[PDB]
Design a protein around this ligand. Sequence first.
Ligand SMILES: *C(=O)N1C[C@H](NOS(=O)(=O)O)CC[C@H]1C(=O)NOCCN
Ligand SMILES: *C(=O)N1C[C@H](NOS(=O)(=O)O)CC[C@H]1C(=O)NOCCN
Ligand code: NI
Ligand code: NI
Lengths: 357, 357
Amino acid sequence: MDRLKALVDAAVQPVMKANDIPGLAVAISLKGEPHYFSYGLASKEDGRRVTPETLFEIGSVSKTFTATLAGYALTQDKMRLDDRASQHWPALQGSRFDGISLLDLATYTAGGLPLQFPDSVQKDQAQIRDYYRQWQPTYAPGSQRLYSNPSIGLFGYLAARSLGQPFERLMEQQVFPALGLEQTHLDVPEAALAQYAQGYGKDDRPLRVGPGPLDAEGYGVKTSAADLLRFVDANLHPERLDRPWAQALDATHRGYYKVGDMTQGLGWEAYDWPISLKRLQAGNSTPMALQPHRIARLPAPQALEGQRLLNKTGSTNGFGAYVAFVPGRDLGLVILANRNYPNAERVKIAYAILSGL
Amino acid sequence: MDRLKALVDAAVQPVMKANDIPGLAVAISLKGEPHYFSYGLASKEDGRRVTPETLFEIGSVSKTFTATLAGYALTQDKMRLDDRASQHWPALQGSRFDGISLLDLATYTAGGLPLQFPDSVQKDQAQIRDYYRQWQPTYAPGSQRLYSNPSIGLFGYLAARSLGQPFERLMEQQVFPALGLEQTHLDVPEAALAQYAQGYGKDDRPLRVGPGPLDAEGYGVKTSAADLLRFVDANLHPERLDRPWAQALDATHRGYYKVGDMTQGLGWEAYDWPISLKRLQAGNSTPMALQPHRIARLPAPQALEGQRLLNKTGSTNGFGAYVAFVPGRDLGLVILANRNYPNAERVKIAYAILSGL
Ligand SMILES: *C(=O)N1C[C@H](NOS(=O)(=O)O)CC[C@H]1C(=O)NOCCN
Ligand SMILES: *C(=O)N1C[C@H](NOS(=O)(=O)O)CC[C@H]1C(=O)NOCCN
Ligand code: NI
Ligand code: NI
């Protein structure tokens, strides 16, 4: 494995140095076997080292887990993607969500739901409900992609409602276990807190993510490199799971439209593979997150398999994560850092590694 | 026996409906007498009905047969569980299998051998050998249980080598006949193909298991409900076979360590009986098959008899099998289906039946 070791060292170390990244865990799945590389410090104050068991905040990578729950709800015939959103929450009946579908919410095409909830919306059922009740669209549903936590957040919350339980309960009791995961959480238990890395912000201050409205659905997962690769491996081989959970994962591997080179799935975003580093970086750039883009809608849902790269970026104030896999090559990659360093740099590491596998 | 009929019907029918199972064969050994219940279709195409003679793929239940061959090798003083793996295959000498025991391989504690051979390893001796020669442990031997086909596959293969014959020949010529079995096969003969059920996959496609490296050892057995109950009955009363085969069966009823509620034997996995449905389901859950678990090693091997439930689950892309017995209550159960439906559902059927006996 010294060959893989040399490749990963060469990819990681220059970027860790250039971005002053205290700690970074890599997990690679190659030819059906895991490989771990654990760099630096989980905490600068007490000098705890990064291991494959260190817990990191993965931020928006959480959307892939949220998509998995929604996938399950489909397999159980509890909801359908063409359902009107308000079908699954009576409180929204009569609002604009009578005419917005679950698919629109999942794929950020509801009509201009913002990146975040207004700063005034606290983590509170009534305030979240009221926000959606009063929300006035900027566009007609299904025409403009605008990356949005309130959009996919609602999708996840409605999936939970369709299954008749809180989102958090379903994730902790059903989803994580069904995926073969045991070190993956929405709220890190007391027993595992010693594994929780410290995050380091823009100003080098220690930071951990605080609560917010629909945080669990949008950006709330904490996990290790080892457990996140287990998730990637389930995505590569959904047959490691029970039938309905295999089907749930399959549902997150279906593309609905294109923006530039990117095909939008549930949570996952896909690309042809190979693709240039420059194009992959463009798909993961700040304008992709912050600008609205017209969508090019596929005539039918497209299976995101074969020679394709499926990926997701995620950040919190103190953390930067990236996950990617190539279904047709059985390659899987996880890079978790305890600094929020640029998306382009994460893609740089991933590309250098994947290019050499 | 309409009373047993009422119990079995009530346990089976709802689960068949819920999981869209085309065909399911139940065989129960109660107080030393067999009872068969045969539901639905062995093939949806030609409407052939399930009978106690229908052949199903039992997947990982095959491991109990593999363990029995190893049990025989032990009785014939051809190998010992403490033996270094490479003692029984000179080709592995100089590899990590110089420091891994037969017991490690049998009980999935070699140090991180994966669930499956990499898809790139073909059913070929050289490729299988090279895989093992190049393999590097994630963990120290004897410390972590990670369920693995290459692991127990090697155990069975090495047992065969110790006896001086191919694994397939030993199973067909010696093991199956010794157990009184005539409808149990690694490869179904032409004469019996009309009995071989069609399997039905995740997507409802007609599926039968295809060849793979060490498939015979890990998951390759096809058998009927009647023949598999005959095997269960041999397990309940080993003294019913020739002395060496009685001893071979006894060897598979010895526990070496615990993980949660489960005591690990050779092939067989054991629990106290009675135990809650919830706990029995956890023992047969996805995290059990996919997560590494630190083992709690027993001071000496524990005889798996009296008030205990010994069981094994098994699946292929198109089939789902479950077998269980309670030595101290002389109870035996076989449930074979031609759909790979969730482990928890199989346990639900079995628990409902066993609790009513
Ligand atoms: C997800 O991690 N997001 C969404 C967005 N950036 O998109 S990404 O480049 O695809 O990750 C803004 C940052 C981030 C969060 O919202 N993270 O949650 C912590 C602050 N709300
Ligand atoms: C055995 O049937 N296995 C082992 C594993 N699941 O464990 S079990 O729940 O104890 O059965 C994965 C699936 C399955 C197979 O490997 N089946 O053979 C076909 C794929 N190699
Ligand atoms: Ni594959
Ligand atoms: Ni008895």
